[PDB]
Write a protein that binds this ligand. Structure first.
Ligand SMILES: *[C@@H]1O[C@H](CO[C@@H]2O[C@@H](C)[C@@H](O)[C@@H](O)[C@@H]2O)[C@@H](O[C@@H]2O[C@H](CO)[C@@H](O)[C@H](O)[C@H]2NC(C)=O)[C@H](O)[C@H]1NC(C)=O
Ligand SMILES: *[C@@H]1O[C@H](CO)[C@@H](O)[C@H](O)[C@H]1NC(C)=O
Length: 218
């Protein structure tokens, strides 16, 4: 996240870190005690058997007893287009069920087909790059963003920080976009580099996948 701020510890207990060899590479969202959702491109060219799903984290630089760690048991994708980044969403069943508590909670999702119009206010988040040559964030970052339809396509939810250069960045992919307390997006891609101030950020449109999600996580 470029130009955001530290989240308060465990402010977003649905926030998940996907890790390889003990290192964060993508966000995810806990959507049931034994399922998370992320961006399909996050798991595309990696050994999924080695992926660790880290719940309850805040500071990547610390050992945190609040953490619960799982592995991937099952993978669901529905028409993921790796070239155009269409349907960039994956559901990952975990090898067990999280203990639900203050620091580990399931997210709330929108109704199928629910559309946020140009102009709605949301919150992006993630442990991705803080900026060019600044590396990934130790502490979970969050960022006030605005849903926009300008420079967007129907198959994405797009957001922009109006008036300054800020946005999501590498390592933020897979992370939730929260609008009215509901997860309406999964970070997918930037254009013109991160925080260009020229192109909005693009999210997989969760609300287009709710029936499919419903069919899997129950
Ligand atoms: C920056 O955003 C925060 C939080 O945004 C709200 O909560 C997000 C998780 C998401 O659901 C968004 O769509 C929401 O808009 C704002 O903090 C809220 O501010 C309102 C108005 O003051 C207040 O009633 C709420 O208590 C706050 N919500 C939370 C979760 O703390 C904040 O106002 C935004 N700042 C600006 C200037 O945009
Ligand atoms: C799931 O995998 C993790 C990490 O490899 C392991 O520690 C744990 O035993 C597994 N959990 C369950 C419930 O099988």
């Amino acid at each position: 996240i470029v130009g955001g701020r530290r989240a308060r510890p465990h402010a977003w207990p649905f926030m998940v870190s996907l890790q390889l060899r003990g290192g964060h590479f993508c966000g995810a969202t806990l959507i049931a005690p034994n399922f998370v959702m992320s961006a399909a491109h996050c798991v595309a060219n990696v050994n999924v058997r080695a992926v660790r799903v880290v719940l309850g984290a805040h500071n990547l630089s610390r050992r945190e007893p609040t953490r619960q760690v799982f592995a991937v048991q099952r993978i669901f994708e529905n028409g993921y287009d790796p070239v155009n980044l269409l349907n960039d969403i994956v559901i990952l069943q975990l090898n067990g069920s999280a203990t639900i508590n203050a620091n580990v909670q399931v997210a709330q999702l929108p109704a199928q087909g629910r559309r946020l119009g140009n102009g709605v206010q949301c919150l992006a988040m993630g442990w991705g790059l803080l900026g060019r040559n600044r590396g990934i964030a130790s502490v979970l970052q969050e960022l006030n963003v605005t849903v926009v339809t300008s420079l967007c396509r129907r198959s994405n939810v797009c957001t922009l920080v109006r008036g300054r250069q800020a946005g999501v960045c590498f390592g933020d992919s897979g992370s939730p976009l929260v609008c009215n307390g509901l997860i309406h997006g999964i970070a997918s891609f930037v254009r013109g580099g991160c925080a260009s101030g020229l192109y909005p950020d693009a999210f997989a449109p969760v609300a287009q996948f709710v029936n499919w999600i419903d069919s899997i996580i129950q």
